With several copies, the nearest count.
Chain A
Amino acid sequence: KTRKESYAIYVYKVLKQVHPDTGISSKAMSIMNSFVNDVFERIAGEASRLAHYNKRSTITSREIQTAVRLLLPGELAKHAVSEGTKAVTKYTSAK
């Protein structure tokens, strides 16, 4: 049949996590995937840009790390890094 994949499974549990027996319209659901896919290119594209400025050829986590910092304002940014840094840190701990 057709494809047209989306992030619907990811957005839904997140909302469950923050009000479990709280609801949503089928119109705000796409707004959400539209919103995510939009932020996706915003961050990953910028990573691509720096990589081939100061003369290197792969994109790691550090770059995102840097990228994120100047893409967003002071207070959210730090918490965001923190969360980000740990999630991965744990990831490696396992293996």
Chain B
Amino acid sequence: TRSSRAGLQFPVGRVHRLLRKGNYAERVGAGAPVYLAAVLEYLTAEILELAGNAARDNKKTRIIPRHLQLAVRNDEELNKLLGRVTIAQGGVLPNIQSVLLPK
């Protein structure tokens, strides 16, 4: 049943409904609900873990907002995908500009 037959972690019989109720095209291609659940799970997983790494970087048991952006902001790729989407209680990377050195 959906997750089973498809073999994914995401809800295949949930995004099908919204795509038909959003009202995208006339009817809906059979391709999509299933495919559309798949990439979504894939992205879901790509962040959680780097967020995990980031929390472990500075040694923490639980991940929190601060971690998430630290993870993404540092990453080259994700960072561009969410280039201008701006973020809850996030703060920022340590950055020291060059000629502002304490010589």
Contact = CB atoms under 8 A, between A and B. Distances in A.
Residue among A44, A62, A72, A74 with the highest chain B CB neighbour number at 10 A: A44
B26 A60 contact: no
Contact of B35 (A11, A18, A87): A87
A36 B39 CA distance: 11
Interface SS of chain B: helix
A6 to B, nearest CB: 11
Contacts of A19: 48-49, 52
A18 B48 CA distance: 7
Contact of B25 (A36, A48, A62, A73): A48
B64 A25 contact: yes
A2 interface: no
B79 to A, nearest CB: 9
12 contacts: A13-B9, A17-B9, A21-B61, A31-B65, A41-B22, A44-B18, A56-B25, A59-B27, A61-B34, A75-B77, A83-B39, A91-B7
Interface of B: 2, 5-11, 15, 18-19, 22-32, 34-49, 51-52, 55, 61-65, 67-68, 76-78, 80-82, 85, 87-89
